[PDB]
Short mmCIF file of C-alpha atoms in Angstrom, two decimals:
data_model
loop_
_atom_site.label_atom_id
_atom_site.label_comp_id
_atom_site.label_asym_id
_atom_site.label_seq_id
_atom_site.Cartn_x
_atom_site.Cartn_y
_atom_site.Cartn_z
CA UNK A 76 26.51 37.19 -0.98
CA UNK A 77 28.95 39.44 0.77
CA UNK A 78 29.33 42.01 -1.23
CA UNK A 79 30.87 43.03 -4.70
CA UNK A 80 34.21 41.26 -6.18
CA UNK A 81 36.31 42.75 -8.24
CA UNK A 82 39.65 41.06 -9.17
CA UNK A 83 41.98 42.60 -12.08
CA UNK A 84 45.13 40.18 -13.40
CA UNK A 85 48.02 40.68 -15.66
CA UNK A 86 50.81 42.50 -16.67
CA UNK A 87 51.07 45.33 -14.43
CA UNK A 88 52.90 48.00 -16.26
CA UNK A 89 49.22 49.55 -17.61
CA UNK A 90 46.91 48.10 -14.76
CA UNK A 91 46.73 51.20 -12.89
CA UNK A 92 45.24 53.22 -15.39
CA UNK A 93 42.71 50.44 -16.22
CA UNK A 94 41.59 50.12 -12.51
CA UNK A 95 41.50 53.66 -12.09
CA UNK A 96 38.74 53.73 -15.17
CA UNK A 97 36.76 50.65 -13.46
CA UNK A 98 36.41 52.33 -10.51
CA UNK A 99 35.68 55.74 -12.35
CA UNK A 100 32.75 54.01 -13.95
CA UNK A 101 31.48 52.65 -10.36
CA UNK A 102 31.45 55.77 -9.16
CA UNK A 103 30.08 57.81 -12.17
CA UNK A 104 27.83 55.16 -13.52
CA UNK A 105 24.96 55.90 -16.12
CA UNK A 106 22.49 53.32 -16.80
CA UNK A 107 21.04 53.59 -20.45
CA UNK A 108 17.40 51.90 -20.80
CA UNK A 109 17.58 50.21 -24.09
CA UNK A 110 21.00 47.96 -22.38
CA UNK A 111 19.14 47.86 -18.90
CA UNK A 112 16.04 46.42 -20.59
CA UNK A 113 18.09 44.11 -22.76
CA UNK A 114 20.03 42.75 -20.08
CA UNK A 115 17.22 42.61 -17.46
CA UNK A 116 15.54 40.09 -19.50
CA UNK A 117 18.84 38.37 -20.64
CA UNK A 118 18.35 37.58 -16.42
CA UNK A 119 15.01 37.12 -16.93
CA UNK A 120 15.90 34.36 -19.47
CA UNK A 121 18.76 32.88 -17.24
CA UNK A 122 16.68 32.49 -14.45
CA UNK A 123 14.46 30.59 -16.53
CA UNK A 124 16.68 28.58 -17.65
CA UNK A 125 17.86 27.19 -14.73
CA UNK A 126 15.18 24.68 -14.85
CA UNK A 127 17.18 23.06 -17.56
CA UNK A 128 20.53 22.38 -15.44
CA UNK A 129 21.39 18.80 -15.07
CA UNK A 130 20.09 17.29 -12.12
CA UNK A 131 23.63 17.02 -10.03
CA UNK A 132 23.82 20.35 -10.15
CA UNK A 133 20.55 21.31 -9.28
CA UNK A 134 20.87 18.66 -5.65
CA UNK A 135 24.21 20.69 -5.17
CA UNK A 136 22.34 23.77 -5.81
CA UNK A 137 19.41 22.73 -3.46
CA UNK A 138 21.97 21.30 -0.77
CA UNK A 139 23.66 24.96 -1.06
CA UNK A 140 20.27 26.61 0.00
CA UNK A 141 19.53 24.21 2.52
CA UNK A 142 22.60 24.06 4.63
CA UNK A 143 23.29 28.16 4.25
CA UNK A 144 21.23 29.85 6.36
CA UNK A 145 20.04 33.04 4.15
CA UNK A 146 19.62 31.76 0.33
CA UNK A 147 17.13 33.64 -1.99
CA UNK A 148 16.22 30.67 -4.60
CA UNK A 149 16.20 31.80 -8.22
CA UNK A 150 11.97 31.45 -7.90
CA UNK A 151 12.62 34.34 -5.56
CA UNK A 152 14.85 36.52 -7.71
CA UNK A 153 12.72 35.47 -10.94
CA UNK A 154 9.43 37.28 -8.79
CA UNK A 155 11.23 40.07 -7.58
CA UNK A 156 12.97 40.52 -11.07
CA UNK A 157 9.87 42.41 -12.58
CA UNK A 158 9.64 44.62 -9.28
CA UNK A 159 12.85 46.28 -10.55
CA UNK A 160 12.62 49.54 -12.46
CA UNK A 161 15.51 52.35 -13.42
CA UNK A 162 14.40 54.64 -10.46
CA UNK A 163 14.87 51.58 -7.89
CA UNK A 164 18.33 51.01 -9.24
CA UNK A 165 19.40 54.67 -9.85
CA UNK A 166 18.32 55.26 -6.51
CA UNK A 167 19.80 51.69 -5.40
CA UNK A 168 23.60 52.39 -6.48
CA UNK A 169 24.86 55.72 -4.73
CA UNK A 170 22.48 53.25 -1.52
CA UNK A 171 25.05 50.91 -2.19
CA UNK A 172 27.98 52.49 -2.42
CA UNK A 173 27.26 55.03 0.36
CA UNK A 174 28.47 52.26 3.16
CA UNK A 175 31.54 50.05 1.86
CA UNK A 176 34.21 48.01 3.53
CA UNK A 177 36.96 46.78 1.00
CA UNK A 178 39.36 43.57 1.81
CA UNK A 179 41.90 43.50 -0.66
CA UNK A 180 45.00 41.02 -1.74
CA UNK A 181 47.58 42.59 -3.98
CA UNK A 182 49.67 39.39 -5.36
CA UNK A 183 52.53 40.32 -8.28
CA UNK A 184 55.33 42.16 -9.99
CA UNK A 185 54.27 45.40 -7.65
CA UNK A 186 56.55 46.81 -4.75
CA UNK A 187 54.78 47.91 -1.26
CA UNK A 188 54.66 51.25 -1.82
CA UNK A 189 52.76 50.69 -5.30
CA UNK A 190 50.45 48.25 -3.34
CA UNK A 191 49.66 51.30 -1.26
CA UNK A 192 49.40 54.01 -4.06
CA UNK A 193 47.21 51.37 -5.68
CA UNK A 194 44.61 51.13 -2.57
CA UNK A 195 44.59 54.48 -1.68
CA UNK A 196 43.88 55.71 -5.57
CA UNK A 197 40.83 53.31 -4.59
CA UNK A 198 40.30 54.62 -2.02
CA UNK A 199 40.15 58.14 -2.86
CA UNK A 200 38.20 57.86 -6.09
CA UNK A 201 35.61 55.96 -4.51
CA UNK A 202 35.32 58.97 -1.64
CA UNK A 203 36.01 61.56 -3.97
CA UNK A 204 33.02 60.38 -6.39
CA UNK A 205 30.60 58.39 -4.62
CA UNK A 206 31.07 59.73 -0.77
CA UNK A 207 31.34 56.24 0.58
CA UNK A 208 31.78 56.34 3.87
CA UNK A 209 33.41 53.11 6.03
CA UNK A 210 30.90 50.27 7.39
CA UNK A 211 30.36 49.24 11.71
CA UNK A 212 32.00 46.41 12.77
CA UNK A 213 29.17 45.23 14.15
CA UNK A 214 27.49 45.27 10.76
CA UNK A 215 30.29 42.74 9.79
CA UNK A 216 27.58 39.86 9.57
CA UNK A 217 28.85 36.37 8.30
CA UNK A 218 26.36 33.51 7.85
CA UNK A 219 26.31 29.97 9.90
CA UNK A 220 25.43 26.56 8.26
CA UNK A 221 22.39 24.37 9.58
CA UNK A 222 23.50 21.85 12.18
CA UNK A 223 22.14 18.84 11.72
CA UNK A 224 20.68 16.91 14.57
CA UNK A 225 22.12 13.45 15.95
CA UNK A 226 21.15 10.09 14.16
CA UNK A 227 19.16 12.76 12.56
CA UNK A 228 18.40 12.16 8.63
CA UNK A 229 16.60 14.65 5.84
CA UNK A 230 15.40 14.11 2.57
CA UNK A 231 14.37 16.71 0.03
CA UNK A 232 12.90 15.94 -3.14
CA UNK A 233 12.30 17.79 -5.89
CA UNK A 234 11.85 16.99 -9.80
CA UNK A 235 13.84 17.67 -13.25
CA UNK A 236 11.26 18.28 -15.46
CA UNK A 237 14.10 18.66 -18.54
CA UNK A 238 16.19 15.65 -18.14
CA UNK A 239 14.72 12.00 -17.93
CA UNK A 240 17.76 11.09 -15.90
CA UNK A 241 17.88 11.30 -11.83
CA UNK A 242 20.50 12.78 -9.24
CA UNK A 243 21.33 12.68 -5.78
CA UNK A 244 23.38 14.14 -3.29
CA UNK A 245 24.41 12.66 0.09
CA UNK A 246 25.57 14.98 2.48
CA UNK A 247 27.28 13.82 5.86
CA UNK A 248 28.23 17.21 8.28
CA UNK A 249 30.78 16.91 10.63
CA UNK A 250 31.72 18.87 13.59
CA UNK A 251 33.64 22.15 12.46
CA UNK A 252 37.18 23.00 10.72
CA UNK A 253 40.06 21.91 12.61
CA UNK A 254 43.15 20.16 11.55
CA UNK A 255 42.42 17.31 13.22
CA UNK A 256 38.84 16.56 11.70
CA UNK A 257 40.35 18.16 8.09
CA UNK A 258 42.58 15.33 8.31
CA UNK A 259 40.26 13.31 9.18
CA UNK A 260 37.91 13.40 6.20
CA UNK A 261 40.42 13.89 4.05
CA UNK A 262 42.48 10.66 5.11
CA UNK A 263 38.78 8.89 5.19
CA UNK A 264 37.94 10.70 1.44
CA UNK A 265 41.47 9.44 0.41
CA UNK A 266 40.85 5.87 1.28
CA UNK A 267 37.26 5.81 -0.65
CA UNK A 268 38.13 7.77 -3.54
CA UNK A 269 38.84 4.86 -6.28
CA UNK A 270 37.14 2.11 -4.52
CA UNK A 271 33.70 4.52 -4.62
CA UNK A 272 34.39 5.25 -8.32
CA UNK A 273 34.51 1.51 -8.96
CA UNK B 160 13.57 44.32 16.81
CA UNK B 161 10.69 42.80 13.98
CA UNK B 162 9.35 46.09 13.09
CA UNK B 163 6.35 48.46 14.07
CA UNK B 164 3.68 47.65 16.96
CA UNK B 165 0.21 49.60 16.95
CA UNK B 166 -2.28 49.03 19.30
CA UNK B 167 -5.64 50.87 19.62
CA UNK B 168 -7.92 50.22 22.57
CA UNK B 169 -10.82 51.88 23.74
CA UNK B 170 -14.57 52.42 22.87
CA UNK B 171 -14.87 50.85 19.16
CA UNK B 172 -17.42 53.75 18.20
CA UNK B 173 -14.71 55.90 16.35
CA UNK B 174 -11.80 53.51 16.40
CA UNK B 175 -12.19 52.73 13.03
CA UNK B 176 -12.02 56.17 11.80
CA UNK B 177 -9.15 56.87 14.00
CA UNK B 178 -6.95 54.00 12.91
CA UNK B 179 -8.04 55.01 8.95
CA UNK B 180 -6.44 58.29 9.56
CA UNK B 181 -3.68 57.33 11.32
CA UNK B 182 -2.89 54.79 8.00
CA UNK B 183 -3.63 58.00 5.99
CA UNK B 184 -1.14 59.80 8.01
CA UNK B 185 1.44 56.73 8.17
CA UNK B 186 1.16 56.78 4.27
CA UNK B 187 1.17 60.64 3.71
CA UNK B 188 3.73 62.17 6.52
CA UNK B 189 5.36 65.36 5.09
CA UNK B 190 8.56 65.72 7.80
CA UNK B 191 8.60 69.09 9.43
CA UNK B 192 12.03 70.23 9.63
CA UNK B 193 12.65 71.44 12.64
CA UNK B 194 10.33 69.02 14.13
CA UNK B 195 13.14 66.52 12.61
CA UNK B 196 16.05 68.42 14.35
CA UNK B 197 14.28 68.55 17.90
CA UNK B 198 13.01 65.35 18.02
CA UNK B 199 16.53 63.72 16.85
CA UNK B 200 18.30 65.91 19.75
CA UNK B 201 15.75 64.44 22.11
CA UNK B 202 16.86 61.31 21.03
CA UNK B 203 19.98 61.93 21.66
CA UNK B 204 19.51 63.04 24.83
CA UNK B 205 17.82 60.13 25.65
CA UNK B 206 20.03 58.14 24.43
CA UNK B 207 22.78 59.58 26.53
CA UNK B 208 20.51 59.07 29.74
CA UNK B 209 20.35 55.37 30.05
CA UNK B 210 23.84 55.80 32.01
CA UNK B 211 21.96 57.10 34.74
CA UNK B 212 19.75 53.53 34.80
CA UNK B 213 19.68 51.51 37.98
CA UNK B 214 22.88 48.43 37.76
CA UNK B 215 20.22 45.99 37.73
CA UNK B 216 18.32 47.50 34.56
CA UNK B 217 21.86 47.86 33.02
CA UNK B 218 22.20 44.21 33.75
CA UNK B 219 19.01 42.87 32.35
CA UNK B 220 20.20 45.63 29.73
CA UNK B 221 23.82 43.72 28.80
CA UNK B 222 22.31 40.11 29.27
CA UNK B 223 19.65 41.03 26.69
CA UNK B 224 21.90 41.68 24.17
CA UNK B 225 24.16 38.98 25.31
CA UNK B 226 21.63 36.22 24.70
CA UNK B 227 20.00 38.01 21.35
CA UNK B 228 21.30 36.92 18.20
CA UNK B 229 20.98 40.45 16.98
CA UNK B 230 20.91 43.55 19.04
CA UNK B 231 22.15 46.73 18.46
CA UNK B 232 23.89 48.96 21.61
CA UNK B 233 23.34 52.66 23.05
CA UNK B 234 26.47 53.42 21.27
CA UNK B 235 26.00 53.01 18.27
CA UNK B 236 22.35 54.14 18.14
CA UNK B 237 24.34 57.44 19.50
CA UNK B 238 27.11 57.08 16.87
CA UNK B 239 24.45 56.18 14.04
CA UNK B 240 22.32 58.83 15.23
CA UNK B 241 24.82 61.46 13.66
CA UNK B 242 24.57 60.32 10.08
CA UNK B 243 20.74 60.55 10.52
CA UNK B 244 19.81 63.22 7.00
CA UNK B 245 16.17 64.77 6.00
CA UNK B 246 17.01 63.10 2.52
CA UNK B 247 18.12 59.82 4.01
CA UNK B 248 14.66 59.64 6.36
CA UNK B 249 12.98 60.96 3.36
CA UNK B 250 13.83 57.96 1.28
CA UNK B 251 13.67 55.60 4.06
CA UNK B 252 10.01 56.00 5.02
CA UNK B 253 8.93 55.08 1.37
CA UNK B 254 11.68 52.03 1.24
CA UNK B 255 9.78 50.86 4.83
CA UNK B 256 6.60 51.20 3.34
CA UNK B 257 7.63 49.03 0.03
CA UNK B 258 7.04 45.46 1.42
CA UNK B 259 5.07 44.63 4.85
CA UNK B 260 3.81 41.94 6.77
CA UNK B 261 1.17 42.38 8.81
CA UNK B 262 -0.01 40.60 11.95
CA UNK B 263 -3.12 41.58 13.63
CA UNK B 264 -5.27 40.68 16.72
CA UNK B 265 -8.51 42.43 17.38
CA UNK B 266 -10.59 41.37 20.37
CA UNK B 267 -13.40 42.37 21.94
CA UNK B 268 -16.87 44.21 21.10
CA UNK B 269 -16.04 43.50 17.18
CA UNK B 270 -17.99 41.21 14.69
CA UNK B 271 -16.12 39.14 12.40
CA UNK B 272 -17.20 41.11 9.08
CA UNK B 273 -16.54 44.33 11.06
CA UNK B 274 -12.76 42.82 11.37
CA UNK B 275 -12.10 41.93 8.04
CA UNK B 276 -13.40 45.59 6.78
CA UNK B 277 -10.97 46.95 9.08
CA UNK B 278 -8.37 44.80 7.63
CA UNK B 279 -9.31 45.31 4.18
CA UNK B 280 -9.45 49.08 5.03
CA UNK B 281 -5.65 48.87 6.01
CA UNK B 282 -4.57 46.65 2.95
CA UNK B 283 -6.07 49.14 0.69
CA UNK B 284 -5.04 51.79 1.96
CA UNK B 285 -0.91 50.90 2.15
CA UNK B 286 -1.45 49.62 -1.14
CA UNK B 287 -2.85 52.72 -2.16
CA UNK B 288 -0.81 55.54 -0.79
CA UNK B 289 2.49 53.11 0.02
CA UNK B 290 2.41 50.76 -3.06
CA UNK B 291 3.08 48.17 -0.06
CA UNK B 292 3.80 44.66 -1.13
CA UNK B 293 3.40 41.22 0.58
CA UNK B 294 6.61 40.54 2.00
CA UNK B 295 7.97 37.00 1.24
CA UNK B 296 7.92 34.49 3.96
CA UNK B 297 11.76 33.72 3.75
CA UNK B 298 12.07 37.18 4.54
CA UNK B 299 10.19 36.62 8.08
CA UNK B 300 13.32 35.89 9.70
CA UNK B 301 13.16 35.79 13.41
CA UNK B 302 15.94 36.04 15.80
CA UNK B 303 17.53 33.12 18.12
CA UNK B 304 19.28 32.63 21.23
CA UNK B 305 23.08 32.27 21.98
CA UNK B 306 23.09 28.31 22.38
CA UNK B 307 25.68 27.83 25.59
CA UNK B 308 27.92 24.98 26.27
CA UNK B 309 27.80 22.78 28.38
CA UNK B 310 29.53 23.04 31.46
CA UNK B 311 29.76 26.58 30.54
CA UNK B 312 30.34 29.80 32.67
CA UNK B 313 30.91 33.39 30.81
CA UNK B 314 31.19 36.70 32.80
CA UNK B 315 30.59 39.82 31.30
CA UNK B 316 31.84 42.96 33.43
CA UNK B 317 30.71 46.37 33.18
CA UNK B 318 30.55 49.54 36.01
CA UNK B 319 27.45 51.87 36.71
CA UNK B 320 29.17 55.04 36.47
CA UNK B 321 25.90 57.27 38.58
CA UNK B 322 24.73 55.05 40.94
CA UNK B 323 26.46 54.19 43.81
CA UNK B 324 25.62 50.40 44.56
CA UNK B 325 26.49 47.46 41.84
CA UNK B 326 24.59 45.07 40.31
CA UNK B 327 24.39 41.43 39.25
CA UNK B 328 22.11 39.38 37.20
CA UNK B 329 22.63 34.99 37.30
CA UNK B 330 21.37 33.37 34.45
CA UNK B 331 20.93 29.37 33.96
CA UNK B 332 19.54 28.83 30.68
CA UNK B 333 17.37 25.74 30.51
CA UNK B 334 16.85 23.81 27.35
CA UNK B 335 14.25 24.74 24.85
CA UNK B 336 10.73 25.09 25.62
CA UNK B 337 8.91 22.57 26.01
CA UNK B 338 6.34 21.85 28.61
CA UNK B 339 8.39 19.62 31.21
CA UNK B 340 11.49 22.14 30.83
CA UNK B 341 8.36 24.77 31.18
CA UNK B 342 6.88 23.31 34.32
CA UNK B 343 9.70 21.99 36.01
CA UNK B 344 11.28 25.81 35.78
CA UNK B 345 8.51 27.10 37.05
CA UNK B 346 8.08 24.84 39.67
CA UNK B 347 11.41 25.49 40.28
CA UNK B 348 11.09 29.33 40.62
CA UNK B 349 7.90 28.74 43.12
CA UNK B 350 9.76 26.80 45.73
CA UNK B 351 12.95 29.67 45.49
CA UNK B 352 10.44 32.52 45.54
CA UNK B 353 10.04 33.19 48.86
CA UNK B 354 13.19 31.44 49.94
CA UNK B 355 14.94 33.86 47.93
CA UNK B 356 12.89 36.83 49.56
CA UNK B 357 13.81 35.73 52.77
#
C-alpha cells in the first residue's frame, strides 16, 4: 500500500549481478500482450475467487478494511480491472517510477562499503534508465486506524456464500503502542491463551 | 482542495450555450506554448508575492494549514512549480478528465426539465470528448481537522518579513458541530463583539 517491495536473499557472492538485472528490467521494461492478457485475467480469476476464502479469513479481511482508513476492496479492483488497457500501463510505469523514495536494509555476509556500492548501483541504474527523481517529504503520507468510540460497539455482517460454516472476529482497540500497554495485552493475551483454547 | 468550482450567473438566455462551449473547450484545450511559459512565470510571481501579505492574512494563512489535514505550502507550490513540463500538463489534463464527480446547484429563473438538459448536456459531453467516468464514492474522500488535546496549548511562530507591525491569531476550537456547540459559540461571539471592539 506504500509502495513497491523488493527483497533479494542468499548467497551473496553472485547477488549483485542478479539485482543489477532486476532493476535493469524495472527500468527497461516491455510489456508483451499475449502475457499481459494472460495474466490480467489470471487477476481477473483471483479476484473472483476470493469469494471462496474461508470465512476467518474473510472477517480478518473485512476487519483489515474497516479499521485502515484507505482500503480499495477486491469489488473495487475487480471493476476497475477491465478499465485497464496496455496504453494506461505503458503510460502508468515511467508515472511511477518518475517520483521514488527507496528505504532499504542490507542484512549479511556484505562489508559497508559493498552495502554502499550495492545502493548506489541502485541508485544509479534507476536514474540512469528511468530518470526517477527523489519524492517531498511532505508527500511522505502514512495511514491512521479508525478510533473507536467509548462503550462504543460495531457489528458488520456479511455472508459466505461458499462455505456452510460461520466466522467471527472480535476486535477490542486499545489506546496506542507503548511499552506499557504492549505489556499490557500481552501479559493479559498470555494469561487467556490456553484457558480460551479450552 | 476537492477539485474544480464553476459558477455561471447572469441572464439564463445564452447561459446554456455558454457553459456548452466552455465544456467543449474544457474537453478540447490545445495548450499554447508560450501561453504555458507566461502564465507559469505569473504564477510564480505570484507565488513569490504572498510575502508581502498583511501578518494577520499570514496568520489566518499558517492556522489554515495548521488545522487542515492536508494542505500544501507556498513553498512547495514554488519548488513544484519548477518540474511543471508541456508533456507532463499534456498528460495530466486527460488523466483529470478520466473519472469525475460532479456536484451541481442551479437556482433561479430555471425549470426543472431545463436543469436536467443542462445536466445531461454536461454528462454527455465529458463522456464524449473526456471519456469521463463516475468516480467511486470511496474515492470522495474529504479532509478533517487536527483533533487537539485537551488541556492543550501549541504556538506556531513565524515573522512578516515586509510589513512592519506583527500579527496574532487565538484560536479555541470547540467540539464538533452540533447545534448547542453552534449556538452557544455564537452566542458567545455576540456578547465579545463589541466588547472586543471597544
Amino acid at each position: 500500500i506504500y509502495g513497491m517491495y523488493l527483497s533479494v536473499k542468499g548467497y551473496n557472492d553472485k547477488q549483485p549481478i542478479l539485482l543489477k538485472k532486476i532493476i535493469e528490467k524495472m527500468a527497461t521494461f516491455e510489456i508483451d500482450e499475449k502475457r499481459f492478457e494472460i495474466i490480467k485475467e489470471a487477476y481477473m480469476r483471483s479476484l473472483n475467487n476470493f469469494r471462496a476464502e474461508q470465512p476467518h479469513q474473510h472477517a480478518m479481511y473485512y476487519l483489515r478494511l474497516l479499521m485502515t482508513e484507505v482500503a480499495w476492496t477486491k469489488d473495487e479492483l475487480k471493476e476497475a480491472l477491465d478499465d485497464v488497457t496496455l496504453p494506461r500501463l505503458k503510460a502508468f510505469i515511467p508515472q511511477l517510477l518518475s517520483r521514488l523514495h527507496i528505504e532499504a536494509l542490507l542484512h549479511g555476509n556484505i562489508t559497508k562499503q559493498a552495502a554502499l556500492g550495492i545502493m548506489q548501483m541502485v541508485e544509479d541504474t534507476l536514474i540512469e534508465h528511468a530518470h526517477t527523481k527523489p519524492l517531498l517529504p511532505s508527500q511522505l503520507v502514512r495511514y491512521r486506524e479508525v478510533q473507536l468510540p467509548d462503550r462504543g460497539w460495531f457489528v458488520y455482517q456479511q455472508r459466505n456464500e461458499v462455505h456452510n460454516n460461520s466466522g467471527i472476529e472480535i476486535y477490542y482497540q486499545t489506546d496506542m503502542q507503548s511499552t506499557s500497554e504492549n505489556m499490557f495485552l500481552e501479559l493479559f493475551a498470555q494469561i487467556i491463551s490456553e484457558p480460551a483454547f479450552n
